[PDB]
Ligand SMILES: OC[C@H]1O[C@@H](O[C@H]2[C@H](O)[C@@H](O)[C@H](O[C@H]3[C@H](O)[C@@H](O)[C@H](O)O[C@@H]3CO)O[C@@H]2CO)[C@H](O)[C@@H](O)[C@@H]1O
């Protein structure tokens with residue numbers, strides 16, 4: 001009925017329904033900050049080249065072993081009225097259909113506000129008043145539409161807030177605005193009462209980089225509703241680390257265990273568990289949940305695919321299990337892209353009956 005953040009997160013190893021409901025409107029620039037409802041936008045789940053989601057696809061993520069699905073959702077091209085941030089009824093009905101598929105199959109769900117560029121790209125004093133008013137109206141409508149779902153459904157308020165093409169440390173200005181987003185989100189969802197009084201709410205660090213929130217109280221823990229304390233909130237970050245493995249393909253190998261295979265980044269097993277410990281001390285020990293809302297290693301190999309895919313299996317095992325035994329939930333990124341380079345995070349092929357074209361990832365977890 002009312003699970004706490006830490007209860008909800010416990011043993012949750014999940015999966016992202018990536019590049020589906022967070023696509024920009026058909027034929028629109030993904031960086032665009034425009035709010036409206038272009039014709040055809042109801043079909044935007046195919047705009048980036050992935051299929052219409054079906055029940056069978058959800059069921060295959062279950063059967064693989066996962067127990068939660070995070071659903072990224074863009075809202076800005078589904079707004080019937082930009083002043084009030086009203087949401088296209090058919091878009092809501094479509095989201096509920098997919099959420100219902102997950103819940104009917106014993107999956108926990110995260111729904112969020114993802115690639116919402118009028119919010120993510122303008123964390124500045126100039127746009128604060130407008131972004132805050134619009135975030136409130138948007139979440140007022142989302143929270144009210146999903147008020148009657150039980151606690152298996154959590155809300156994450158935003159995704160990666162940052163100035164465009166800028167992945168560095170926020171300014172004081174950027175931090176002030178983005179922390180204000182998290183507070184507004186909490187206030188608005190709690191003010192709809194009902195099952196939202198104690199629904200698991202997920203808050204983000206700046207650009208979902210843990211290092212931009214873990215120091216100096218950079219990340220501000222919001223004031224929740226009276227008596228809730230911190231027990232019904234989590235801190236979310238994304239953990240594509242070290243970015244040299246996993247991200248930009250500088251190294252093909254990771255860990256002291258695989259030093260004999262090739263060259264490895266300085267960040268090893270210890271730098272990871274050190275960090276996880278530091279997130280326990282900063283946040284968990286205060287009663288907050290910890291959600292790793294995105295992680296993964298992009299499929300990339302110079303020479304010896306076997307040896308690289310084995311090290312990837314060990315990376316996936318080490319990350320999931322070390323997170324799990326500290327009470328974190330994990331959600332692996334999947335964009336349904338396969339190959340050898342950047343942004344090759346596909347696990348299942350969504351065009352071929354959900355066939356597992358990356359068994360080495362699924363060997364790492366599970
Ligand atoms: O190929 C189809 C479209 O791809 C777009 O890039 C997306 C990537 O495919 C997707 O893997 C990436 O996922 C992000 C995720 O959204 C973010 O929250 C997380 O923290 O990191 C992941 C890895 O970067 O999202 C991007 C969208 O920004 C192209 O931008 C698009 O042109 C193309 O049609």
Ligand SMILES: OC[C@H]1O[C@@H](O[C@H]2[C@H](O)[C@@H](O)[C@H](O[C@H]3[C@H](O)[C@@H](O)[C@H](O)O[C@@H]3CO)O[C@@H]2CO)[C@H](O)[C@@H](O)[C@@H]1O
Nearest residue numbers: 165167168208209210211238239240241242243244247
């Ligand atoms: O939308 C794709 C864009 O991706 C950019 O790469 C950034 C990643 O999206 C982001 O996840 C990563 O965050 C790293 C951080 O850089 C690193 O210091 C730390 O160790 O881990 C963080 C999370 O794992 O940052 C990179 C950029 O530094 C591309 O740079 C961009 O071209 C592309 O459009």
